[PDB]
């Protein structure tokens, strides 16, 4: 399980929260809406290992 919230430093130059080109937040919201299609509708997954 990865819970990293650090900005992804895609560029060689540092990305310390700059959010410029090659600098962006790792986590993106799904923004589920019922209007979305079945493929985009949320699905709850339980993996029994």
């Amino acid at each position: 399980r990865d819970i990293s919230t650090e900005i992804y430093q895609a560029g060689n130059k540092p990305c310390n929260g700059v959010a410029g080109f090659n600098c962006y937040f790792p986590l993106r919201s799904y923004s589920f809406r019922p209007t979305y299609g079945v493929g985009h509708q949320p699905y709850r997954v339980v993996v029994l290992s």
């Binding site: 895609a10 410029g20 080109f21 090659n22 962006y24």
Partner: protein
């Protein structure tokens, strides 16, 4: 990535970083000029003039 200070580069179905690692069957570039507030209108499933 050298085009303008604060360009908005929004990729749907792909990642901005990964484009260099992919092969594309058919590529089309559509160029136009719009108002800034109408930029968000250029996206899949959006409402505007």
């Amino acid at each position: 990535y050298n085009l303008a200070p604060f360009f908005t580069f929004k990729c749907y179905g792909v990642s901005p970083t990964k484009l260099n690692d992919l092969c594309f069957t058919n590529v089309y570039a559509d160029s136009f000029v719009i108002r800034g507030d109408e930029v968000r209108q250029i996206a899949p499933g959006q409402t505007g003039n």
